[PDB]
Design a protein around this ligand. Sequence first.
Ligand code: GSH
Ligand code: GSH
Lengths: 218, 218
Amino acid sequence: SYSPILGYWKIKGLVQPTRLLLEYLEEKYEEHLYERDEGDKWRNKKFELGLEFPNLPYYIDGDVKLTQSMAIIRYIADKHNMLGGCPKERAEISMLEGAVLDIRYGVSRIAYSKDFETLKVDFLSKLPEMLKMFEDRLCHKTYLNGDHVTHPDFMLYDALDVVLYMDPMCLDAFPKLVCFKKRIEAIPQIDKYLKSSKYIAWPLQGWQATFGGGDHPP
Amino acid sequence: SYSPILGYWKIKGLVQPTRLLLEYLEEKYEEHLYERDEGDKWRNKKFELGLEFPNLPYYIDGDVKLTQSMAIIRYIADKHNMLGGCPKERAEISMLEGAVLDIRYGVSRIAYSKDFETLKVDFLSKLPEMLKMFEDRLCHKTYLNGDHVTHPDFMLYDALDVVLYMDPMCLDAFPKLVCFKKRIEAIPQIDKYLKSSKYIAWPLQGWQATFGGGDHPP
Ligand SMILES: N[C@@H](CCC(=O)N[C@@H](CS)C(=O)NCC(=O)O)C(=O)O
Ligand SMILES: N[C@@H](CCC(=O)N[C@@H](CS)C(=O)NCC(=O)O)C(=O)O
């Protein structure tokens, strides 16, 4: 019926992989976007949406009123029969999921820290071990789960996008990941989306983050 | 056939909710437990298990070779038809999941920090907002998803166990959560497990954590 609603800060943050999945699926959706100066506007609306666990992002479509970014992206995947056709494949996809989140949360965890520049050294020292596993995973695979796209592909894409801002050379040792990122960008729906006015380029985290914050790239 | 293997540090950490679920299900499993001084022993074995994304915990049963704690607990749930009977219920359970992880990771995220005692003030200031949602969730509900146990019940239980160590009064304002914790402890399988030699009481995080570390409680 009506367009489902994806609500979130006007930032990449937790919801960027979900946006990419929806666009890949060419699904109609509309967003409720909260701006940098709309914190009080959100807090005044937060507990008045029928949400069991009020938070950003939320996703409302007439069947569900969801929070939790990973519940939301998995629901959208589930509704298109992409979560896995059996327990073994579902676990495989949840494993891909978590491994990507080790990278993405690894960033988010330190981005608001006052000592970011110190913590970032540790994260960047450990990052190649995490990347290596995906590089190996993509040996003779088009996407993370073989010949067909799954939602962790867009999670990985988002993670790669973000860590490149932390160190533009961090993928130099990982040619298959560099190719993967280009391959996602070569999905016509995704190419179209990234060139559209719907695409949010910045910020990566909340505007007040030490890394990936501010109104514009450094 | 043979007992599945759950591999992890001899700590509560990421895998405690999974142990509780298995025991609730009265499932046979054996553990491969890595001790405080077995870091090199693990690193020598890490890449020799056929794991796609080598890590702790792992779970091996002859059908799967999994890493990622959330993939593992969901696989075990899935194998007992507990993940949800439709996309709406599956999303509900993933939402419960993520909300619990906001508490549990909220702890894990700061526990190894040098400035834990400062960061802990912020976390404990925000914690009541998170707890309030579960307190509300349990109004006239036996478990988080109604009349029947689901894996986020054991995740919440574990989260409550851990935050009580950070502040033994943090549940004083939340009687239904205090009751919930007692209700889980009153599941006979769980009561039996917590009294058994299989139960690991400490540490909460890795032994070297600032919070929830060491060989014994403070
Ligand atoms: N685990 C939650 C975390 C949500 C979260 O931390 N949201 C932040 C933005 S990244 C927020 O501003 N929430 C608004 C609020 O707390 O009211 C998720 O994955 O959605
Ligand atoms: N997201 C992963 C995190 C795993 C993780 O951080 N494991 C730590 C212990 S809590 C570890 O020691 N892994 C061993 C290794 O890196 O080889 C999960 O949920 O399993």
